[PDB]
C-alpha cells in the first residue's frame, strides 16, 4: 500500500557469512522487501546483499560502499517466475553461488523476485505473461536508484545478469532504460520514482528475438531431420529441483516442408536488418541461406575451437573441424550442426498448437497463450490469436537498438555455448553485432563446448566488472 514508503533502511542488514573458495565471506543481509507499493504476486521482493566491509568503513577489490557495483541477477528460465536469489538458498532454481563470488568480489548484490508466465494471484487469476517480467526488473531497478546512498553501492554501476530467459531479461533491461512503453504498468505497481537506465548487461544464452527465432532456428538446422531434447519425470527432492528426461523424435514430411520455408524467410529478415562487418562492409545471406553472415557464423565457431584446442581440449568431439599444425583453418559447417544434433521441432518457439513456453509467455488473462508469428496464426491447428504487435515489439532487446541512444546501457557481455541448441547461433550473434554496429561495447563469444546454461565463466566475467567499475 502507500504506507509503503520504498525507503531501504541500512538498519535492516544483517551479519551472515558464507564459505567461498574455502574461505570465509562475511556479508550483511537485508531480505523480504516489497519493492513496489501495489504489489499483486507475493513473489515481488527482493533481497539486498552488501559486502560486510561496507558497513565498517573499510574496501573490497578496490571498492568502497559508496562506489561499488550493484549486480541485479535474476532466476528466470522459461519465462517462468524467478524468485529473489539468496547465498544461503539451495532451493531451484537458484544461483546462490554467483552471489557468494559476488560478494567476494566486493559487489553489492540487489536480488529480485520476477512474476512469470505461470504466476497467478490471490484469486487465481493468471498475473505474470508479458510484459510482467521486465516490468518487475525494471520495478527492482527503480527501487535501487531511487534508494542512492540509503542502500550501499553505486546506483550508477547497476549490471543486469541472467542466463537463457533471463539473459533476454538481462538483455532487455539494458536495451529498454527509461521506455514510455512501460510506465503505465510501473505506474499501477506504485514502482519508486525514479529511472530504470542500466551501467552494464550481462547475458547467457539471451532467449530473445522471439517472433523471429522460428526463421532463425530452422535456417540452422534444416536439413537435420531428428530432434534430441527433455521432459520431466516424476520425483520429490529436497531441493525442488525439476527432474528430466531425454525425449527424442523425428520431422513429419509436414514439419521439414515448413523447415525450408522458415529457413529461406530467414535470409529475407536477416539481409533487412543491414548488419555490417568491422570493416562495413553488409553481412548478407543468399536465396539459399550462404553468404557473408553464414561466414561469421563460422568464423566465431573457429575462434571457439582455437581457443579450446590451445588448452588441450580435443576438439574431434564434434565434426567438422579442420586443423592444420595447430590452427583451427575451417569448419564444415554442416557437419558440426549434424553432430551437436538439433533439440527443437518445427516450429521452434511460435508451435502450432499454441504449447511452446513462449506462446504461454504471450497469452493475458483472457487466453493462456497466443502466437506471435503470422506463420503460425496462419497455420495453427487450434483456435488463437496472435499477441499485440507493440507488446512483440516491446520485449524485444532489438527494438531499442536501431540506435546510438543514451538509454541504452554502455557495456555489454554476451556468450552463447558453442553446443547449446536452444536457439539459433543467428540470434545472439544478431544482438551482438547490432550493438557494435550502433557504437556500444559488446564482449561476445561462443564458448567451446558449454551447454544450455550460464554463470559458469564468472573469473571473466567479473574481470570485465572490474575493468569498467575500478
Ligand atoms: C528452460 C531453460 O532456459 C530458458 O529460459 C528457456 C526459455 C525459453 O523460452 C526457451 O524456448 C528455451 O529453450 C529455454
Redesign the pocket.
Given at each position: 500500500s502507500m504506507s509503503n514508503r520504498l525507503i531501504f533502511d541500512a538498519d535492516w542488514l544483517v551479519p551472515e557469512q558464507v564459505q567461498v573458495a574455502g574461505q570465509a565471506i562475511q556479508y550483511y543481509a537485508a531480505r523480504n522487501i516489497q519493492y513496489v507499493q501495489h504489489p499483486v504476486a507475493a513473489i515481488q521482493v527482493l533481497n539486498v546483499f552488501v559486502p560486510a566491509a561496507y558497513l565498517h568503513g573499510s574496501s573490497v577489490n578496490g571498492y568502497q560502499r559508496a562506489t561499488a557495483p550493484i549486480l541485479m541477477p535474476n532466476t528466470?528460465?522459461?519465462?517462468?517466475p524467478g524468485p529473489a536469489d539468496d547465498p544461503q538458498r539451495v532451493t531451484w532454481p537458484t544461483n546462490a553461488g554467483t552471489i557468494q563470488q559476488a560478494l567476494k568480489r566486493g559487489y553489492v548484490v540487489v536480488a529480485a523476485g520476477i512474476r512469470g508466465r505461470t504466476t497467478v494471484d490471490k484469486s487465481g487469476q493468471r498475473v505474470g505473461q508479458a510484459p510482467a517480467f521486465i516490468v518487475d526488473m525494471k520495478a527492482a531497478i527503480r527501487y535501487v536508484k531511487y534508494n542512492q546512498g540509503r542502500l550501499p553501492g553505486d546506483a550508477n554501476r547497476i549490471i543486469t545478469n541472467g542466463?537463457?530467459?533471463?539473459?533476454?531479461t538481462s538483455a532487455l533491461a539494458g536495451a529498454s532504460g527509461n521506455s514510455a512503453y512501460f510506465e503505465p504498468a510501473l505506474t499501477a505497481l506504485g514502482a519508486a520514482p525514479a529511472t530504470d537506465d542500466i551501467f552494464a548487461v550481462s547475458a547467457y544464452?539471451p532467449?530473445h528475438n522471439?517472433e523471429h527465432?522460428d526463421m532463425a532456428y530452422e535456417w540452422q538446422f534444416n536439413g537435420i531431420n531428428d530432434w534430441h531434447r527433455y521432459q520431466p519425470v516424476a520425483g520429490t527432492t529436497k531441493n525442488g529441483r525439476p527432474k528430466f528426461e531425454p525425449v527424442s523424435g523425428q520431422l513429419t514430411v509436414e514439419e521439414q516442408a515448413l523447415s525450408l520455408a522458415l529457413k529461406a524467410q530467414f535470409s529475407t529478415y536477416l539481409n533487412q536488418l543491414k548488419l555490417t562487418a568491422s570493416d562495413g562492409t553488409h553481412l548478407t545471406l543468399n536465396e539459399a541461406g550462404m553468404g557473408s553472415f553464414r561466414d561469421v557464423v563460422r568464423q566465431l565457431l573457429i575462434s571457439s575451437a582455437q581457443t579450446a584446442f590451445d588448452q588441450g581440449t580435443d576438439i574431434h568431439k564434434y565434426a567438422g573441424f579442420v586443423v592444420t599444425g595447430n590452427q583451427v583453418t575451417d569448419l564444415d559447417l554442416s557437419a558440426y550442426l549434424k553432430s551437436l544434433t538439433r533439440?527443437?521441432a518445427v516450429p521452434?518457439?511460435d508451435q502450432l498448437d499454441l504449447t511452446?513456453?513462449?506462446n504461454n509467455?504471450f497469452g493475458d488473462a483472457t487466453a493462456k497463450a497466443k502466437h506471435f508469428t503470422a506463420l503460425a496464426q496462419t497455420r495453427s491447428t487450434v483456435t488463437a490469436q496472435l499477441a499485440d504487435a507493440e507488446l512483440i515489439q516491446a520485449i524485444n532487446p532489438l527494438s531499442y537498438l536501431t540506435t546510438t541512444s543514451s538509454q541504452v546501457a554502455k557495456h555489454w557481455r554476451i556468450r552463447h555455448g558453442a553446443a547449446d541448441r536452444?536457439?539459433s547461433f543467428a540470434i545472439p550473434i544478431i544482438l551482438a553485432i547490432m550493438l557494435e554496429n550502433h557504437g556500444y561495447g559488446i564482449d561476445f563469444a561462443l564458448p567451446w563446448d558449454i551447454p544450455?546454461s550460464g554463470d559458469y565463466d564468472l573469473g571473466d566475467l567479473f574481470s570485465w566488472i572490474d575493468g569498467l567499475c575500478q
Open positions: 528466470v528460465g522459461g519465462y517462468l542466463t537463457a530467459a533471463g539473459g533476454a544464452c532467449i522471439l527465432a533439440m527443437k521452434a518457439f511452446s513456453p513462449e509467455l536452444d536457439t544450455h
